């Protein structure tokens, strides 16, 4: 959950730069998919 949370913060940093260039956030949409799988582990950790 911590390793996924570290990758999720770097994702926010990348998204802030994607909006500057306009560029359609497709690489962000694939990371959000990895972050969603992380958030599912984060819910299993919030239960633990």
């Amino acid at each position: 959950e911590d390793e996924y949370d570290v990758k999720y913060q770097m994702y926010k940093i990348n998204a802030r730069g994607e909006n500057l260039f306009g560029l359609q956030n497709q690489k962000y949409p694939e990371l959000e998919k990895t972050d969603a799988e992380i958030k599912n582990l984060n819910k299993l950790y919030n239960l633990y």
Binding site: N19, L20, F21, G22, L23, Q24
Partner: protein
């Protein structure tokens, strides 16, 4: 082609400034000007009253 246009408009290729002018607040006032009061005076003069 629609995304590419949205992709063409940047933050460093279309800044978005706000500008207003300083407007004084409107205000409604009354001013009544009445001239000095005007008093009637009655004087008589005769040769004796002058001399007296």
């Amino acid at each position: 082609e629609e995304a590419i246009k949205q992709t063409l408009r940047n933050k460093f290729n279309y800044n978005t400034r706000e500008c207003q002018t300083i407007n004084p607040s409107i205000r409604e006032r009354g001013v009544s000007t009445e001239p000095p009061p005007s008093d009637t005076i009655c004087g008589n003069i005769t040769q004796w009253e002058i001399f007296d």
